[PDB]
């Protein structure tokens, strides 16, 4: 039904705006397969990509292939890059993703219960305060043409406007996967791009840690 599938349409999303925008250190939260960090480290202007996962067991083997390769060495980076792999829930703080550049928080909030949903705002926005969060979740309103809920565009904008407001950002919407007859649905997978206007809390579990090497 779409051309690339729709995942890859999300990643792609993500991937433009690190083109677009450079972020240096960028977080995705609910990284699952590691299949974006995969996509993001193309670009050379990431020093710091990380990845945050309750699921354990989904990040299994999956550090490895991140590590240099031979190739990595003989055709050297101009600056290092640090990947690292995390254990760890959006709805505890950890001090190691402060001062972030880019988070992304691909088709995640849909998981959170109503408990955990009331404090992810407070920790993605409040605590860590990246410079720019990209909030993705499904458009319940292209369903006629396991997720705790199903929000229409109204529902998530709404929800997207009081945080922009309480934790100073503004928020833009957009998304991916076109209706193609009644084009008034919008778009498959509804999508916030938020822009912004010291105790140490090591939480999280780092399950895999690799660093390149580099020479500028
Ligand atoms: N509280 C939480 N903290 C961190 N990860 C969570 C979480 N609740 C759910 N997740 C994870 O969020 C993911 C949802 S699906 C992963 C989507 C992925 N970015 C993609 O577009 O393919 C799962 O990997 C699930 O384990």
């Not at 690190?18 to 050379?44: F, I, M, W, Y």
């Not at 202007?45 to 996962?53: A, M």
Request: charged share 25%.
């Amino acid at each position: 039904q779409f051309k690339p599938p729709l995942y890859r349409q999300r990643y792609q999303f993500v991937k433009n705006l690190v083109d677009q925008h450079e972020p240096k250190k960028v977080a995705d939260l609910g990284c699952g397969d590691t299949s974006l960090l995969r996509l993001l480290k193309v670009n050379p202007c990431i020093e710091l990509l990380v990845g945050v996962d309750i699921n354990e067991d989904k990040l299994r083997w999956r550090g490895d292939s991140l590590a240099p390769f031979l190739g990595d060495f003989l055709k050297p980076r101009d600056l290092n890059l640090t990947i690292t792999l995390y254990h760890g829930s959006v709805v505890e703080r950890d001090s190691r993703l402060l001062g972030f550049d880019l988070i992304t928080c691909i088709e995640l909030i849909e998981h959170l219960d109503s408990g955990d949903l009331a404090r992810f705002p407070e920790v993605v926005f409040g605590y860590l305060s990246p410079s720019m969060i990209v909030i993705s979740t499904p458009n319940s309103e292209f369903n006629p043409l396991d997720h705790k809920f199903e929000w229409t565009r109204m529902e998530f904008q709404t929800w997207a406007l009081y945080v922009a407001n309480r934790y100073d950002y503004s928020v833009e919407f957009t998304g991916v996967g076109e209706p193609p007859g009644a084009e008034n649905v919008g778009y498959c997978t509804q999508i916030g791009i938020f822009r912004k206007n010291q105790h140490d809390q090591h939480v999280y579990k780092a399950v895999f840690t690799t660093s390149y090497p580099s020479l500028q």
